[PDB]
Amino acid sequence: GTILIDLSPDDKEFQSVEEEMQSTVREHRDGGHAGGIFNRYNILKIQKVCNKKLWERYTHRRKEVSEENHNHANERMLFHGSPFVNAIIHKGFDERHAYIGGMFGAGIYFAENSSKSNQYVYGIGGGTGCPVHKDRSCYICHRQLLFCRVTLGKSFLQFSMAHSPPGHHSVTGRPSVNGLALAEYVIYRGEQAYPEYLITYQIMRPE
Ligand SMILES: Nc1cccc2c1CC=NC2=O
Ligand SMILES: [Zn+2]
Description:
It is classed as transferase. The entry lists the keywords transferase, protein-ligand complex, diphtheria toxin like fold, ADP- ribosylation, transferase-transferase inhibitor complex. It forms a monomeric assembly. The entry is titled "Crystal structure of human tankyrase 2 in complex with 5-amino-1,2- dihydroisoquinolin-1-one". This protein has four helices and nine strands, in the order βαβαβαβαβββββ. It is of the alpha+beta class. The protein has a single domain, classed as Phosphoenolpyruvate Carboxykinase, domain 3. It has a five-stranded antiparallel beta sheet, sandwiched between helices. A four-stranded mixed beta sheet has the order 4-8-7-6. The structure holds 5-aminoisoquinolin-1(4H)-one and zinc ion. 5-aminoisoquinolin-1(4H)-one binds next to strand 3, strand 4 and helix 4.
């Protein structure tokens, strides 16, 4: 049931999605080991992901969360990187997209920094890098991220599939050492995210 609509680079929506991609690149403590060395991306395509069943699954859970949290879904747009982008856009998020070994337990992880999600496109820790050249810093091969609508509801704040902490709908990983890092977020039900944009890109070699 999924269809992908290409956005024009002239479309304000393409432009606002690209700006969130580009403006949330940071340097990483691994010096580029997992995700490569880059300060910016070459955006090749941005597609809107349209699936009625999946959307209605999302908005149903969103209303449940909202009614449990004084009519506040606490909805964010966040990045997700994974080698299973194609399963996600067609069948939705579920337990098979959980990061079992993540620092907040087995849940589905999202990032405010696009460059954080970029580290997971080829696997945990970047895996063995691109399938073609086995390079985690490949500047040639096309990568994909999701920019997703995520319902956080009442989020458990951690300074730093399973269930959410009692009385909470998600976990927030607040950075407490690296002053430049943005937050990461974990949900424990696939229905609390909808994969709204598929972004196809390359990382760009710094000059
Ligand atoms: N662990 C973590 C933190 C933030 C974002 C992501 C992840 C994992 C996979 N994909 C992600 O996009
Ligand atoms: Zn490659």
